[PDB]
Symmetry: C5
Subunit: 96 residues, 5 copies
């Protein structure tokens, strides 16, 4: 199944988790802005312990999405909107 | 192994791919699309997967996205033409 | 190994003529007019695969598009020169 | 498995990555939101420097790196620009 | 395996990768002083095949995926002044 989250200013941080192990990874597929996103740089980072790794920088009028290739993560994973108001959408898939 | 494609627009905001797996390859705008952000998502949960705008980014390459039918593509925003392309796999 | 064509305003078509073609990139030449070019794959019908435009996106990387002969490439919109590259797989 | 990243910027232009064996697979390069609006170039140093990415905030603020798998130690340097420029990768 | 690259420019429009082992291309990118014009790079099968078009204020680099090449190959700057840089790995 396809997975998605939305990061935005009210909800800057989203923790993806899990009812089974199983060992399934989350493979990122794309990151993309909503069409009422403010016209400013939006930066999405992966958080783990404190270290975060920026992985995408976007801006509506410059670069509104990015294709993610090869990123496979071990749950639990935390995504965070380091900069920007969003909506910023992340998509992915379950992988074995 | 052989090419598939759909078209979404204002009067056709949806396309069900029904009855193997679909590998997406590209999403791109037609040349008369209006100059606005277009968002296409997968519903089966709604998950956006591309945001495009003719004078900013008129296409994207999709990598790794392989889907089991049935899946519906929706144009969450924008009026199209927006084309999705892919391959049976 | 390496292969490519050139579609343009005279030559809108190129037929890849009968194992397997892996597209690599599609890119515009430096004198394409500044307009939307669209390239579709035609079958034995039609699936737009790249939208480009010199001052917006003048090339794209193709990933995962592997084709069985025959297949034809059409310059649906635009003057060209537009170049496709590929590799026999 | 675990995600890796580094920040190259004007103060710290060079970042040396050091570790049963394990390559570093790069995933993305991207600019910070206060980077100056100028071209940033990043290169791998081994002395021969090979540039791998050029970015600029108002033109192309990030890129996806595909297939670049490196054997430690690797050195990243900011050939141009002041950053922040962020690199992400995975142990593989 | 190991990192390879070359600089192509107006004075040196060609670079020949010379001789088992293929070259997997990774990126192409422009220098911060390239002029603001379309640069094109093609593989010369010595049919030259363009593989990239870039321009500093529109698109200053691109990611190559799946291009693996047997030497001898030659890369040619079909337009543009450069510096244009190409990167790759021996696979």
């Amino acid at each position: 199944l396809i997975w998605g989250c939305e990061l935005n200013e009210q909800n800057k941080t989203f923790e993806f988790k899990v009812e089974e192990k199983c060992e399934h990874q989350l493979a990122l597929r794309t990151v993309c802005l909503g069409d009422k996103a403010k016209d400013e740089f939006h930066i999405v980072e992966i958080v783990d312990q404190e270290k975060s790794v920026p992985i995408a920088t976007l801006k509506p009028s410059i670069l509104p999405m990015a294709t993610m290739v090869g990123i496979e993560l071990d749950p639990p994973v935390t995504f965070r909107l380091k900069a920007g108001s969003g909506p910023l959408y992340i998509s992915g898939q379950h992988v074995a």
